[PDB]
Amino acid sequence: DENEHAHFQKAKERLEAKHRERMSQVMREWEEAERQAKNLPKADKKAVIQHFQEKVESLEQEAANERQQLVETHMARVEAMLNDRRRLALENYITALQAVPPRPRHVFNMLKKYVRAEQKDRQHTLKHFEHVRMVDPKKAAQIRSQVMTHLRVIYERMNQSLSLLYNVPAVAEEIQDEVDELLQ
Ligand SMILES: [Cu+2]
Ligand SMILES: [Cu+2]
């Protein structure tokens, strides 16, 4: 999850290096084209400029394509890993609550891992959405709904899991304070 974000930044940089690379040989080609067009007419010259401007435009388009694709796949993998990570954490938490006798510290640790999984998912979804919002405001307004509902779910699923803590008030009391630190 943090392995794939180290795997995301990597692929992200390779993509940049790759782009900046193709972009450099285009400006390079542009030059020899300018020197070679040294003895050609103006018309053929005004057209050599358009050719390379369109060439650069195409490169930019592709880089943008690769980025979006990379991010999409990234969102898919992470969403799968985070849900999986949450489920397992929710299980250990519930199992902890049903312990006989219930162990406060153990319940908390399990609860902590769970809150962090939910918080990780929320923060992750928020960060990526805010990225698009900052870069492409109009695009962000498209996925806006699909993104807020997601956050609404995570929030409700966590609060619902937190309240399970009241089925064992003695434990809830003994760790209430530490739980607050967690939620802040
Ligand atoms: Cu570029
Ligand atoms: Cu991410």
From Swiss-Prot:
Keywords: Alzheimer disease, Amyloid, Amyloidosis, Apoptosis, Cell adhesion, Cell membrane, Cell projection, Coated pit, Copper, Cytoplasm, Cytoplasmic vesicle, Disease variant, Disulfide bond, Endocytosis, Endoplasmic reticulum, Endosome, Glycoprotein, Golgi apparatus, Heparin-binding, Iron, Isopeptide bond, Membrane, Metal-binding, Neurodegeneration, Notch signaling pathway, Nucleus, Oxidation, Phosphoprotein, Protease inhibitor, Proteoglycan, Secreted, Serine protease inhibitor, Signal, Sulfation, Transmembrane, Transmembrane helix, Ubl conjugation, Zinc. Proteolytically processed under normal cellular conditions. Cleavage either by alpha-secretase, beta-secretase or theta-secretase leads to generation and extracellular release of soluble APP peptides, S-APP-alpha and S-APP-beta, and the retention of corresponding membrane-anchored C-terminal fragments, C80, C83 and C99. Subsequent processing of C80 and C83 by gamma-secretase yields P3 peptides. This is the major secretory pathway and is non-amyloidogenic. Residues 140-157 are annotated as: Collagen-binding. GO terms for molecular function: DNA binding; enzyme binding; growth factor receptor binding; heparin binding; identical protein binding; peptidase activator activity; protein serine/threonine kinase binding; PTB domain binding. One of its GO terms (biological process) is cellular response to manganese ion. Residues 1-182 form the E2 domain. It is found in: Cell membrane; Membrane; Perikaryon; Cell projection, Growth cone. The modification Phosphoserine is found at S58. Residues 8-40, 108-139 are annotated as: Heparin-binding. Induction: Increased levels during neuronal differentiation. Its main location: membrane. Glycans are attached at N159. The keyword Phosphoprotein applies. The modification Phosphotyrosine is found at Y114. Binds, via its C-terminus, to the PID domain of several cytoplasmic proteins, including APBB family members, the APBA family, MAPK8IP1, SHC1 and, NUMB and DAB1. Binding to DAB1 inhibits its serine phosphorylation. Interacts (via NPXY motif) with DAB2 (via PID domain); the interaction is impaired by tyrosine phosphorylation of the NPXY motif. Also interacts with GPCR-like protein BPP, APPBP1, IB1, KNS2 (via its TPR domains), APPBP2 (via BaSS) and DDB1. In vitro, it binds MAPT via the MT-binding domains. Associates with microtubules in the presence of ATP and in a kinesin-dependent manner. The transmembrane helix undergoes a conformation change and unravels partially when bound to PSEN1, facilitating cleavage by PSEN1. The basolateral sorting signal (BaSS) is required for sorting of membrane proteins to the basolateral surface of epithelial cells. Functions as a cell surface receptor and performs physiological functions on the surface of neurons relevant to neurite growth, neuronal adhesion and axonogenesis. Interaction between APP molecules on neighboring cells promotes synaptogenesis. Involved in cell mobility and transcription regulation through protein-protein interactions. Can promote transcription activation through binding to APBB1-KAT5 and inhibits Notch signaling through interaction with Numb. Couples to apoptosis-inducing pathways such as those mediated by G(o) and JIP. Inhibits G(o) alpha ATPase activity. Amyloid-beta peptides are lipophilic metal chelators with metal-reducing activity. Bind transient metals such as copper, zinc and iron. In vitro, can reduce Cu(2+) and Fe(3+) to Cu(+) and Fe(2+), respectively. Amyloid-beta peptides bind to lipoproteins and apolipoproteins E and J in the CSF and to HDL particles in plasma, inhibiting metal-catalyzed oxidation of lipoproteins. Promotes both tau aggregation and TPK II-mediated phosphorylation. Interaction with overexpressed HADH2 leads to oxidative stress and neurotoxicity. Also binds GPC1 in lipid rafts. It is linked to Alzheimer disease 1: A form of Alzheimer disease, a neurodegenerative disorder characterized by progressive dementia, loss of cognitive abilities, and deposition of fibrillar amyloid proteins as intraneuronal neurofibrillary tangles, extracellular amyloid plaques and vascular amyloid deposits. The major constituents of these plaques are neurotoxic amyloid-beta protein 40 and amyloid-beta protein 42, that are produced by the proteolysis of the transmembrane APP protein. Cerebral amyloid angiopathy, APP-related: A hereditary localized amyloidosis due to amyloid-beta A4 peptide(s) deposition in the cerebral vessels. The principal clinical characteristics are recurrent cerebral and cerebellar hemorrhages, recurrent strokes, cerebral ischemia, cerebral infarction, and progressive mental deterioration. Patients develop cerebral hemorrhage because of the severe cerebral amyloid angiopathy. Parenchymal amyloid deposits are rare and largely in the form of pre-amyloid lesions or diffuse plaque-like structures. This is Amyloid-beta precursor protein.
